[PDB]
Amino acid sequence: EFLKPRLVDIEQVSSTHAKVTLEPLERGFGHTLGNALRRILLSSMPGCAVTEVEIDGVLHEYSTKEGVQEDILEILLNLKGLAVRVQGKDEVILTLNKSGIGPVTAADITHDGDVEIVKPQHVICHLTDENASISMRIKVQRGRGYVPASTRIHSEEDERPIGRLLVDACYSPVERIAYNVEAARVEQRTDLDKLVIEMETNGTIDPEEAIRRAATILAEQLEAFVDLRDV
């Protein structure tokens, strides 16, 4: 004798911001599910992000190119924010080649099939010289959580090329999560609740898939709970 929640309308206010509703929630489970999902989403949502970059004329993060105004280090800091969606492969190599005066945005990346650049207006660099040209090859991986360079250094795995520029990996698409449990007047019932999850992401994971995967992870851990050895 229970009720159970069914995923209902998923409002999209912006490309990044989304509201997801769950209508038939039993009394008391509003907050339980809200918080469990909030935790899972903020912690464990898999995403793809840039791990390392190779630019031609630059030995290390601290040098500088002719005809650009950002330092190379600031270029990496801008790349960390690059929101990208990878579909099939786990590690993709994007290529950015731009010349002439203008802001090098993410749109200028060489368009590959499997990779989606979510925010093409996202700036990367600014050239300032007619003959100034920037080329770089950005390696993008899939992962969960947050992995810094210094930890992966244990697993260097032939980092020998001095042209390599390691970037801190924020393998996480979800930026913000809030939930409200509010009275869900069901036509034949007195006291039922609806959970409304408002989530702000970098626009790679879709809301439906995020919620489904989070529920999946929580359910798997619950599976771990169902059996108890006691042996």
Binding site: R38, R39, L42, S43, H60, Y62, P148, S150, R176, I177, A178, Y179, N180, E198, E200
Partner: protein, 49 residues
């Protein structure tokens, strides 16, 4: 002395537990723990501190 060779190392030091942080008003402290985003308090809107 015939000759000298100087080498500059640059190191990016990230904040970690034990570093000292302060305000402008005389408040001090040692960074005691790095919490995951989910554990941190959050307002109704969902923004964590």
């Amino acid at each position: 002395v015939l000759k000298i060779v100087k080498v500059y190392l640059a190191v990016k030091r990230r904040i970690q537990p034990g570093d000292k942080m302060a305000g402008r008003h005389g408040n001090k402290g040692v960074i005691s723990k790095i919490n995951p985003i989910e554990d941190m308090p959050y307002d109704e809107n969902g923004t964590p501190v």
